[PDB]
Automatic annotation (TrEMBL), chain A:
Fusion peptide 1 (FP1) and fusion peptide 2 (FP2) function cooperatively and have a membrane-ordering effect on lipid headgroups and shallow hydrophobic regions of target bilayers. They are considered as two domains of an extended, bipartite FP. The membrane-ordering activity is calcium-dependent and also dependent on correct folding, which is maintained by an internal disulfide bond in FP2. It comes from Human betacoronavirus 2c (isolate EMC/2012). The chain holds residues 464 to 513 of 1353 of the full protein. Glycans are attached at N24. It is found in: Virion membrane; Host endoplasmic reticulum-Golgi intermediate compartment membrane; Host cell membrane. Belongs to the betacoronaviruses spike protein family. Spike protein S1: attaches the virion to the cell membrane by interacting with host receptor, initiating the infection. It comes from the Viruses. Homotrimer; each monomer consists of a S1 and a S2 subunit. The resulting peplomers protrude from the virus surface as spikes. Specific enzymatic cleavages in vivo yield mature proteins. The precursor is processed into S1 and S2 by host cell furin or another cellular protease to yield the mature S1 and S2 proteins. Additionally, a second cleavage leads to the release of a fusion peptide after viral attachment to host cell receptor. This is Spike glycoprotein.
C-alpha cells in the first residue's frame, strides 16, 4: 500500500495518524470498500522487459 | 522456414515476429506427420476429431 499507493515524505517532518469516524459524526460518507493498488508496473515495447 | 516450404503459417494469441524478437523462457517444438488436405481439421482448439 505504501509502495504503490501513498508514501509519506522522509525529508519533511511527517506524522502518520490512523483514525476511525465516530457514529455521531455523519458528515463523512463510508466508501463501498477500502481500495488500494497491490502493484503498478510498465511493460516495455519489446514485451521482454517489464 | 527455409528448410520446409510453409503451406500454412498461423499463430494464436501471439505474433510470429514477436516470438522471434522476444527471448523465450522455454521453447516447445512439436513435429508430426499430417495430411495437407485437412488444413481445417488441424486447429489450436476445434470440435474436429
Amino acid at each position: 500500500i505504501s509502495q504503490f499507493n501513498y508514501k509519506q515524505s522522509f525529508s519533511n517532518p511527517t506524522c502518520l495518524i490512523l483514525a476511525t469516524v465516530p457514529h455521531n459524526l455523519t458528515t463523512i460518507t463510508k466508501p463501498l470498500k477500502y481500495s488500494y493498488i497491490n502493484k503498478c508496473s510498465r511493460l516495455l515495447s519489446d514485451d521482454r522487459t517489464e | 522456414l527455409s528448410l520446409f516450404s510453409v503451406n500454412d503459417f498461423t499463430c494464436s494469441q501471439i505474433s510470429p515476429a514477436a516470438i522471434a524478437s522476444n527471448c523465450y523462457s522455454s521453447l516447445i517444438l512439436d513435429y508430426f506427420s499430417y495430411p495437407l488436405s485437412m488444413k481445417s481439421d488441424l486447429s489450436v482448439s476445434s470440435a474436429g476429431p
